[model samples]
Structure formats: C-alpha cells, structure tokens
Target: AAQTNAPWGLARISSTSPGTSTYYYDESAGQGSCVYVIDTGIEASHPEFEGRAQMVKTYYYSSRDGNGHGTHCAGTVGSRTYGVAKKTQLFGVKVLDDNGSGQYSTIIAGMDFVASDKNNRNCPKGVVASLSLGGGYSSSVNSAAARLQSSGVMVAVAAGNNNADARNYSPASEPSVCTVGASDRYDRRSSFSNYGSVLDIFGPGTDILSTWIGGSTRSISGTSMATPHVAGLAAYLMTLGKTTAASACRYIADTANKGDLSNIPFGTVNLLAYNNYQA
Candidate 1:
C-alpha cells in the first residue's frame, strides 16, 4: 500500500504531522454505513466508485451530472481510491441541476427524500448526507437541514466559498449542521473559504483530486470539496458507534488537531478535521 501515491488531501488527515503522502485509515473505514451525495448525480460506473455508488434518488430530473460538482463530491465522500469512506454505500441524490445551482424547494425535496429512504434503516452503521452547495440565508433551507439531524442522519454542508463569514450563508449557518470550511495542504485557510464561529471544522479543499464527470478524474477547489471530507469521516465514525450526528460532530471537533491552521480570519475556529490516525 505504501507504493500507492495518495493525494495530499487523503494523506494529510491520516497523520499528525503534515507532508506525508500515505493515507492511513481504520480497516472498517465506513464499512457498512451509507452516504447520501446530495448534489448532482454521480457518474456511478466510474472505476473510483467500484459499483458502490449510484443514483438512488432523484426528483424532477434524471439526476445525471452535467456540472461535475455532485460526482466530484461523491468521490470525495466514498470513492474506492479517491474518497474517505472506502466501504460505504453512496447513494446519489440530485437536487441541483447541470448548472450546479438550484432552488431551495428542490434542495429540501432531496433532503426529505433522504430522510424517508428505507435503505437507511438497513445500512446499520448510520447515514451521513453530504451537501456541498449553499446560498444566502433561508430559514426554510436551514430548517429542512436541521430536521435531518432529528431524523438521525448526520448532515455535512459547505460553509460557502466567498471568504466571508459563514453566517452569511444558509444551511452553513444552521446550528444543527456540521458546517465545513476549506483548508489547503499546508493547513492554511483557503483564500476563498468562508469561515466563522459557525463552522464546525475545516478540511483539505484546495485543488482536491477526485472523480469527475465522464468517469474521469479531475481536481477543483471550494468548500464544496471540503464538505464531503467531513461527511466521509462522519460515515467512518458512525461505524464506531458515534451514530448520533451530534456525537460524531463533537468527537471530530474535540479530537481535531487544533491551533495549527494559518491565516484563519476572525471568529473562525482553527479546528482542522482529522481521522485520529497516525501514519
């Protein structure tokens, strides 16, 4: 396994010290948990998914990814080689359209679908929904995302990429959601990542490499890329009996390697997400 070259985003979380290129994780790495990729649909047959990811739910559209945002986020959540949770089943829920934008009604519909999915009960480990999109604050959107937590599904959302306070966005500012900010390989706040006391944590987001549309692989940047990192970790933690969304969030934030990130703006917590592994 040491012969394999992992992306820095993958390699960074598994170790305490930075700059290591090998990714280390527990054997159970999301072994039986499920992740709902709540974005555009995934290119399911991509080799990176190894048949474990698919479009299980869609509404008012085919759920096929045209913008690459959903598929890429899916890969970062649980692709075989590129994502965090290796053995987790990823169910793609397409709420956003090809342009990678959508109305709040559609987003809430997707979240509702995930909350009612029968397969979630059968998964056993737990469920984590990864949402990598955001917009100006909307009470309805925030309430819908919060309700998912009550339904026992951990929700991880992007803190937006405007480099402003995360409170400026919806769902990201939702108290019940695990809002994630973006950090680079060197543990520096990404110039574009929105931050604030509202953020639960940060993850490697700058130029992250993962599965793209057309079954290809590409790298991009944003809190969109960072959100799934925490989502995937939540799935992994669920396997360890941190099944409650709040419990998992607390463990991640409490155990996170702190005080190392650079250039974090005012009101932001410098809690970088970690896997609690040391390579």
Candidate 2:
C-alpha cells in the first residue's frame, strides 16, 4: 500500500519528506526489537497499537493509561499510525500514578524490573527503555540506568520540560542514558526544553500528533515526546543485531544527521535527522 502522509515527528527524525507516498528510512520499523515505556502506562486497546503494546507492570494505578502520557509516548515509539518504529513490540510499566506523578524510587524499581526481566522473549536484546518523566536528581535512578546499560538495555530519557539546565534533572542527567531534549518542526530547540552538557540529542516535540487513550489521537508537546523518537530509532538499530547498549548508542549517535540549531547553545544540543547530516 502507498503510504499517505507520514507523521511529522517520524518524518523529521527519519528524514522522510512530509506527504511522501512511501516509507523510506524506517522501512524495518523496528520489527525485531521492543521498547518499554516507563511512564503512566499505555492504552493497549488503542487501534494504533493493536497487538503491539502490552501492559507488563503497574506501580500505582490499578490500570494502565489513566493520564494518557504513557499512551502518547508509546504511540510515538511503535504505533502504526503515529510511530517511528511502526512494528516494534511496546510494553508499559506504570511508575506514575493517575495524577501523573511518581517518586524517583518508583522509577528505579521500574528500571530494575526491566533489567532483570529482559531475558524474556519480548525483549531479548537492544531493549530500549523510554522514560519521559523527570524531577530532582537521584543517584539510585542513575545507578539503575548504569546497571541496565551494563545489562545491554538502551535507555532514553526526557531532558525535562523545565527549560533549565538538564544537569539539574535526575535521569536526564544520568550517565549511560540518552538524554533527549525537544526540538520544533523548524529544527530549533523548543522554548521549554531543557538543555546543558548532559543532553544527548534533540527530537521533534512541538505539537506532536500521536495515539491517545480511548482509541483516539491527539497533539501534545514536551521533551517527553521527543525522547521516544530516539528510543524508537534505537529499537530499529537493535534489529540490525547490535546486541549491546553501547553499540546501539554509538550507531545512533554516529549515524544521526546533525540538525542546524544555531539558536541554541553551542555544546548543549545535537539534533537528530534520519539520513543526512546537516551542519
């Protein structure tokens, strides 16, 4: 089937032109890999996700997807209609509550669960942990990220919507995790996206359209939205048989086409493009 209009965020990251009638850069759609979204949770019944998303665990809420944040992020990762890795298996681990909040310890526990559970068939290797939540710094969360990396799981974290230095945030500044900041459709940093030396890359976050709860779609914005673009890309790279976290990160960072973000601070931003490297 001829592809209709590609999602703007996916097109921007994959370097596909808007309204392109065929899939190009992300042809594999992360077919052989999986991504775990550690957030409010996902709406498993959303049509865009269908059989792709599984609710593996819940930390606070009795059900998954009370706030819709996780479902939105999950759609960006692997939903067929609004995703980068269109076919990657999606799993949700609810660390946040119905009110869209959680403790750092809860986040750490979620990571621990993923690290010890990757031996399962759904997430064997190159499992990308997509985390869109952030607050104060936490050594324990950072430590869990390090352990997950050592265990061969790639982690992608939102650089926070605070518009401050990413160094001030916990998992965003955590070592061994891909700290993602938000970029707009114009390829510039979103006004509210955090920056600083800790950030690893930028992804389209402004007015991003993705699957929502109740089998619907909606447009939202945040570094949370941007993080999944990179996570999905990392999952795609995983299917190429890169078995380790370091390998996956290197391939993604090295192959990423730099975006021209002259507006942002010099060393604080690295823009992600699917194919061409723009300086």
Candidate 3:
C-alpha cells in the first residue's frame, strides 16, 4: 500500500546483507553470558560449537520428535559450533519431539520451565530465551512473557512461518515478547513469512546454516530462522549494556537497511544494518 511504482515490490531489499554478520561478529562471546534455546535439543558436540555451548537443561513433552527444526534454530542463534552467539550459553526445552508436533499445553509448559528453571540454580541472570515456534495466539503466553520480563529474562519468538500478516501466534504476539519475522538473503520478506503490526523486527531466514540432530548441518528457511537471529543479537546486546527489549529493537531497526525495495508486494526490512549499530 506504500510504494506502487517500485520494481522488486520492496520485498527484495536483502535483509540478509553481510553487514548484519559483521555487526554480529562485533558483539558476540564475552564471558558469563547464557542464552536459553526453547526448542529441540541441539548437537552440543558440533565442531563449530563444541566448547562454546553450555547446556543448562532439557525437556520433552507430548509433542512429536522435534522435526529437527529446533536444532536449525539453535545453530543460528547459539550453535557456537558456528552460530551468531557463540559466547552465550545454550539451553533447551524439548516441547516437540522427533515428529515436530506438540499441543499448546505442552508448549506452554515448556515456557514455564524456562521462566523458572529451579533445576539449574547456578545459571546467571539476564538469560535470553528464544522461542522459534508458535501455534496460536493465547493470553496464557502473554501473561507468561510478562512474568518473565519482570524477572529480567528476555524472550524471543517467531511470528509464524505461514506467509501472511495474520496475528503472530501466542507468545510471539504477546507484548512482553520480542516477535520476529523472516526475510530472505535479498532482505525482502520470504514469499512465505508472516508479517503484521505485531512484528517487532525481521531477520535472516533464507537458506541459513545450522546444526541437525545427529551431528550435521542443514540450511533451512522460515521465520523460525529469523527469530534466532534476533535472539543471538539480544545476547550480543547484553554484552554492550543494551538490556531492555526496546533498546534491542531500536538498535536493530535503526541499523537495518534503508535501501530501495520495490520488488515484492510488501515492503521489506534490512536487518544487517542493526549488526552495525547504525541508524
């Protein structure tokens, strides 16, 4: 509805620019930092992240075997084996098992576990928990995120991979959560990514590299991929003293691309710009 004369329809803006990688490199891996990955278990033994990841906990619910989606998401955010936030700690909650299916109740329980992890008492504060999955929007998720926020825990969620501007399911649509959208290497929205006013920011989701269950790398696509990028960026921001969700989003959006995108139907965002911390 904005620009009608553009060529690429704005979706070809290339949010996956190299600048984001460069920015990511600038603020990753300090010490005493931990990031909780609420997905399937990650292959901690991967070559790119063997000594870099610290698994604080793991869980399994009624959901099917996590379609290995969590691993890919983990690899992008904190795989350390070669991810965006290598220095940060990596935690897991297996809500969905091998089959990549789970009930809302199970997913909610996973969030609860992450919010109050009594099992790992020694874990540091300011931990960032990234949720790369979403079912339907729910008040339960909102309240949970609010509780987590009050405790200084950061939660990042995928704004549904389905290609539409529908409400970004459950936790992602919640006010306290950092809802993320997907973009391709071209910096434009993937033809399949969801978007809307609920969206907080966009990230790289085109053919991204990450780890799989049995010690392998997979290049997957979706808003799931985008969510972790922001999660990783959040961990990096913490290192630079940017703690609040607003600051993180501001840093990211401010630095994102201001290029001309007139390709696709919807306008696109440039996430790499945030990595540089440029407005």
Best by TM-score: 1
lDDT of 2 at 10: 71
Q: What are the per-residue Cα lDDT tens digits for candidate 3 across 160-233?
A: 87776636477777865777777665556776777776776777676776777667777777878878777877
Q: Candidate 2 on 216-254: residue-level lDDT in tens?
A: 899999999999988888887677564356666556666
Per-residue CA lDDT of model 1 for 1-279, tens digit only, reads 231578788887776877888888877879879899899789998888998988887764586888888999999988888888888899998898888888899899888889898354467888889999989999999999998877888899999999898887989999888999999988889999998899999999998999998889999999999999999999988886754565777788988889889999867898988888643
Global lDDT for candidate 1?
0.86
Per-model C-alpha lDDT, please? 0.86, 0.79, 0.62
**How displaced is residue 159 in candidate 1, in Å?**
0.1
Alpha-carbon shift of residue 17 in model 1 (angstroms): 2.1
Clashing pairs in 1: none
Q: Give the CA lDDT, 0 to 100, for residue 112 in model 2.
A: 91
Whole-model lDDT, model 3: 0.62
- Report the error of model 1 at residue 40, Å: 1.0
lDDT comparison, 1 vs 2, better candidate: 1
TM per candidate comes to: 0.96, 0.92, 0.79
TM-score of 2: 0.92
Query: For residue 145, what is the lDDT in candidate 2?
Result: 78
